Design a protein around this nucleic acid. Sequence first.
RNA 1: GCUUGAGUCUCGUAGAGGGGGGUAGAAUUCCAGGUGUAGCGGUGAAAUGCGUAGAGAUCUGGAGGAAUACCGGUGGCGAAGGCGGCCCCCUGGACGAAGACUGACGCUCAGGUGCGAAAGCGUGGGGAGCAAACAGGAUUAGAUACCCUGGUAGUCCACGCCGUAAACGAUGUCGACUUGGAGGUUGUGCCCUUGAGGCGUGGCUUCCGGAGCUAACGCGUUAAGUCGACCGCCUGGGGAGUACGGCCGCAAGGUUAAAACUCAAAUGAAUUGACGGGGGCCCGCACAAGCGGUGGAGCAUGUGGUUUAAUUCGAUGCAACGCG
Lengths: 151, 116, 70
Amino acid sequence: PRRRVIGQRKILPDPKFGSELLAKFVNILMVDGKKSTAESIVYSALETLAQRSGKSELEAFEVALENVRPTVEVKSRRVGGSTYQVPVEVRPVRRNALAMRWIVEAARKRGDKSMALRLANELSDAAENKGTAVKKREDVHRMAEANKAFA
Amino acid sequence: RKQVSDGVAHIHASFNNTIVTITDRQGNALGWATAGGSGFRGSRKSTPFAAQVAAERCADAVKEYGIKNLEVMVKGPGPGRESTIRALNAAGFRITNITDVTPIPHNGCRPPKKRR
Amino acid sequence: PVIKVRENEPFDVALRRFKRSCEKAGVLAEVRRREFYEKPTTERKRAKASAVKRHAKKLARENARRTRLY
RNA sequence: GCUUGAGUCUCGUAGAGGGGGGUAGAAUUCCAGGUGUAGCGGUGAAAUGCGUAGAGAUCUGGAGGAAUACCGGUGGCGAAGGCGGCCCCCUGGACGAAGACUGACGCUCAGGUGCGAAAGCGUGGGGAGCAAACAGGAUUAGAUACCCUGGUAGUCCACGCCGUAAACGAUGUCGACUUGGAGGUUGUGCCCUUGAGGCGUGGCUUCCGGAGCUAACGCGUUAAGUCGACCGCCUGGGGAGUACGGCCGCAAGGUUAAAACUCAAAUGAAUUGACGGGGGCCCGCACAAGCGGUGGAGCAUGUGGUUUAAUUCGAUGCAACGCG
Ligand SMILES: [Mg+2]
Ligand SMILES: [Mg+2]
Ligand SMILES: [Mg+2]
Ligand SMILES: [Mg+2]
Ligand SMILES: [Mg+2]
Ligand SMILES: [Mg+2]
Ligand SMILES: [Mg+2]
Ligand SMILES: [Mg+2]
Ligand SMILES: [Mg+2]
Ligand SMILES: [Mg+2]
Ligand SMILES: [Mg+2]
Ligand SMILES: [Mg+2]
Ligand SMILES: [Mg+2]
Ligand SMILES: [Mg+2]
């Protein structure tokens, strides 16, 4: 809004691991207001991720986040005939939300069988620094680097 | 070649570009680099950052001569008036002195007509 | 606006002193002023218009000195 | 006769006042070279244009024409137009102090005469920059415009002509009188210049306001106040500062200057709104940040159309169209 300043809501942590960073992930991944069928997708893909490679389920997820977080991004503004794109820094809370949105959105485009399997593949590629959720991070970093003159 | 020790940096700042030329103390040019030739064609070469890269590339291309001291001679207005000099220190040169040369007529020739 | 860098000095001190020398000399104002031709009748009108503002705005704050706002 | 108007003489002061002749520095452009490489220039974005025959940049040498940064100031001078580097020659006006002198010699002025920006004209020179016309590139529905790249007359000089400008404080010249304040600039008198001081007196000028005047806005000791002398001009809007005639001009054209016809208005200042691709402040799922849709497919339903014996009537920008 233009007048008020709003304090963020409180989010209950997930039952299995008690971590609020994952509790948002099942919120972002959930479509159609059904947490039960989404918490199953997140839990299955975390077990597939941990069993396949790495240590633990909470650190395996965190590593996938770290590669896909954006540290800089462009905010478009108009001046004359055309539009400019000044680069801006990302606040840490927005950095996380942008990371999980990119992971989920880039796991729905995979051609695998079940979303529990597409998600587990994507957290794997994000940790190993491949896939298309990390490509978007580099794309955003490029659009900020190509417009660095407009800072 | 010829191992020049003392040079002069000629920054031709303008409203539309920025040309950095490094010459010896006798005026002979040793190498140059502009802002628009640095991959900054269009409305990005006016920006002071595009002129910084010009100072970097012009710091190169004189590697062979091995200059160790630079006098900076800024000319004209424009964004690349400040960000070019500091990039000639961040490139490892020594700025002995800075002199501003600029053509200011004592009411000489008639300038062009006002834009509308 | 020639500035000579002294001995036992930093650089960012010198560059700030270069701007101060250039700002005091009005180099960029003169370059911007001489870019296009200003007709003599617009150079004289722009001078009297800016002196009228200098007089009124000084007398405007004087009439506002002897008031209470709340 | 007189000296309170007007003028003359003595001494100084300030000033882009005028005419002529020299000279200085910065900068633009061009010419001849050295170094040096692939871009330069321009724009909202581009392209035309210049460049590998080597531009742009940078240094050296030279030639040319025009204008005088800073000082510089609702500062100064001039009747108006106007006048800005520095020096010399010729020259006009103003002002101030103390005196001497002439003794109404004064004010205005139809015709008349002179001066009169810029553009323009003629003859002869000059030509850097800028730039009507012109050409190209863009923008555009079109763009014989604004924008960009070039560019001739002109802008400059000598001598003639033109004689008009929003030639404007839209306010004719001269004289007298009528509360104040803060400034600028330029002389002069008195005293503790004894110390960046204090008090008077003149000339010119910018601002704010009192009585008064004014339709109002506003003017207000430099009146648009209160009076006197002389001159110029006005008499509803359009036609029209036009036609014909006279004078002037090389020409462009200037000046003097109507009528038929036509309308009941045209106009000035102020007031309340509305509007603005004027300004400031603030708000709204207005945008920005996000989630899910419509526009495509099949069907339901409503409406325009066409059809029909009738396809009953109504609502039909937002604010009609799963509405009565
Ligand atoms: Mg231009
Ligand atoms: Mg007379
Ligand atoms: Mg007469
Ligand atoms: Mg003329
Ligand atoms: Mg001529
Ligand atoms: Mg001629
Ligand atoms: Mg007239
Ligand atoms: Mg005038
Ligand atoms: Mg008149
Ligand atoms: Mg007044
Ligand atoms: Mg006539
Ligand atoms: Mg006639
Ligand atoms: Mg459909
Ligand atoms: Mg119906």
